[PDB]
Ligand binder design. Structure first.
Ligand SMILES: CN(C)CC(=O)Nc1ccc2[nH]c(=O)c3ccccc3c2c1
Length: 165
């Protein structure tokens, strides 16, 4: 056996962003940034050909909803790309299509920022302001809709993934 090491910390809290125009000072309430570096996940209907080329881009870094509580409660275009600590959250998204695997620094830990008592706390969300560059997307597994399971012989690694710890 061996015990795991601690995580590298980038000076820039949105180092991972695919759209660097995001304005960290407009995030409300004051963000509590994730400091761990385990695999995160994102259920998305968008296909890997697109995600591996572009990364995850947010809907609207300019005029989107920068208030995290508002974004979480009432889905609206925002500067954030949502991910989760929970490998299995894809089972709750119908027509999910894909479970993406993400190894990215930072992100806003939603429950540490707005509390763990709101309606969607069990999503254990990490919100990435400005999204996530493709170099931080490990890969993807397609999801079988009828059983809500991963088609594990059809997982694909992202050729652009760059390990960093
Ligand atoms: C960037 N938009 C396409 C995303 C959207 O409007 N909703 C959305 C779309 C996909 C999402 N996927 C997730 O894995 C997730 C995990 C924790 C919390 C939220 C999500 C999530 C939310």
């Amino acid at each position: 056996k061996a015990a795991a090491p601690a995580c590298p910390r980038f000076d820039d809290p949105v180092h991972a962003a695919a759209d660097p125009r995001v304005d960290v000072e407009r995030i409300t309430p004051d963000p509590v940034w994730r400091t761990t570096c385990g695999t995160l996940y994102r259920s998305d209907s968008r296909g890997p050909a697109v995600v591996f080329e572009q990364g995850f881009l947010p809907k609207d870094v300019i005029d989107g909803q920068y208030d995290i509580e508002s974004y979480v409660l009432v889905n609206q275009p925002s500067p954030y790309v949502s991910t989760t600590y929970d490998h299995d959250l894809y089972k709750t998204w119908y027509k999910s299509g894909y479970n993406y695997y993400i190894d990215a620094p930072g992100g806003v830990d939603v429950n540490k920022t707005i509390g763990d008592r709101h309606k969607w706390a069990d999503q254990v969300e990490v919100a990435f302001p400005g999204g996530i560059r493709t170099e931080f997307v490990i890969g993807v597994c397609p999801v079988d809709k009828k059983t809500r399971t991963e088609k594990m012989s059809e997982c694909v690694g992202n050729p652009h993934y760059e390990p960093w710890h």
